[PDB]
Amino acid sequence: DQTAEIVIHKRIYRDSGLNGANFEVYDASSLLKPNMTPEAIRALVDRYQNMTRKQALKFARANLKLAGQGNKGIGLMNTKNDPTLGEDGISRITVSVDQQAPTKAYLMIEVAPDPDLERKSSPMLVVFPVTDPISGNPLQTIHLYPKNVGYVRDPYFFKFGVHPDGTSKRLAGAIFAIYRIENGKKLYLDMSPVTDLRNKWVSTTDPLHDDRVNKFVSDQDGLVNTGERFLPAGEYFFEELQGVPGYERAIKIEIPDSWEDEDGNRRFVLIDGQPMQENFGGVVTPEMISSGYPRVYNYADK
């Protein structure tokens, strides 16, 4: 009789649309009883939410049937680009609902993605109706935001110049690029938009003048900052493409694969071996700029 749309927006968060995620959707109406309380409903939703995906799949595969018109078939959803909203990570399913009494429900569980990412989605039990606070009315479209976590870090350093008389200063106008090594070849961090919380890398004959290659310029505080750009675990290099006049190099970036070690202690990004202070979210603060560490010293005296 009546139908509703469930829309998954699968995105990547750091503790962003992710294509190729897969979900199975089961008719869960049999988990419901007539004249259930809202409290009983919330208790049943929490029970399924607190199961692992594997646990919920053992229960659903054995006992329930796929249901709903998904893009991969009955009960089958794959995340893709949505031209209608120009956003990635989108999958829509049409399901049979009862907007007047809680008698229809769907259990949605992520399965293996299409052939550095924590897939943290939970089993999601959608019990209709879902009442719109704003309007009173039952919702006709449910938007779900299953959680995926990408691990990224935020390298920066300060460029200082040292005079032969031992005076020193922050250097403005040094131009850097970032490269990594793959099969004995340099790939440079490009200007392409991030997809799946992952960067694009280009081979170039001339990184300084190649518009594809992202450049990072030292500012009036000496700061060379990735800024909005981030990197995942591994080893990278800031390469000086144009030195500051009078102070005319690869600076190694070592990114650990986790914020904390087995004992809870911070694992630092190392800049040419120096531990780099960092906050969650990666913003270089005014206090960090005052500190001006880690510092790379460029010598005037040839």
Residues that bind Na ion (CB under 5 A): 49, 122, 154, 226, 274, 282, 293-295
State in angstroms the smallest separation of the CB of 141 from Na ion. Answer: 24
Residue 53 vs 92, nearer CB to Na ion? 53
| Tokens (6 digits) for 28 | 């869960």
| Tokens (6 digits) for 113 | 């993605």
State in angstroms the smallest separation of the CB of 287 from Na ion. Answer: 16
Residue 78 vs 274, nearer CB to Na ion? 274
C-alpha to C-alpha distance for 278 and 258, rounded to whole angstroms:
13
State in angstroms the smallest separation of the CB of 117 from Na ion. Answer: 17
CA distances for 82 relative to 14, 196, 209, angstroms = 23, 15, 35
Instruction: Decide: 162 and 297 in contact? Cβ < 8 Å.
Output: yes
Residue 150 vs 294, nearer CB to Na ion? 294
State in angstroms the smallest separation of the CB of 39 from Na ion. Answer: 20
Residue 249, CA atoms < 13 Å, CB-side half-sphere? 16
Hey, what's the torsion of the CAs at 89, 93, 97, 101, to 10 degrees? Answer: -10
C-alpha to C-alpha distance for 275 and 270, rounded to whole angstroms:
5
Indicate the helix (H) or strand (E) that contains 234. strand 234-242
Residue 4 vs 154, nearer CB to Na ion? 154
Which residues, other chains included, contact 33 with Cβ-Cβ below 8 Å and sequence gap of 6+? 40
Residue 47 vs 72, nearer CB to Na ion? 47
State in angstroms the smallest separation of the CB of 43 from Na ion. Answer: 15
DSSP single-letter state for residue 146: -
Q: Concatenated DSSP letters for 85-133?
A: GTEEEEEEEEEEE-SSSS-EEEEEEEEPPP--EEE----EEEEE--B-T
Residue 4 vs 237, nearer CB to Na ion? 237
State in angstroms the smallest separation of the CB of 69 from Na ion. Answer: 27
Which residues, other chains included, contact 212 with Cβ-Cβ below 8 Å and sequence gap of 6+? 188, 190, 191, 192, 202, 204
| Tokens (6 digits) for 39 | 């409290």
State in angstroms the smallest separation of the CB of 124 from Na ion. Answer: 9
Residue 138 vs 227, nearer CB to Na ion? 227
Residue 293 vs 299, nearer CB to Na ion? 293
State in angstroms the smallest separation of the CB of 297 from Na ion. Answer: 8
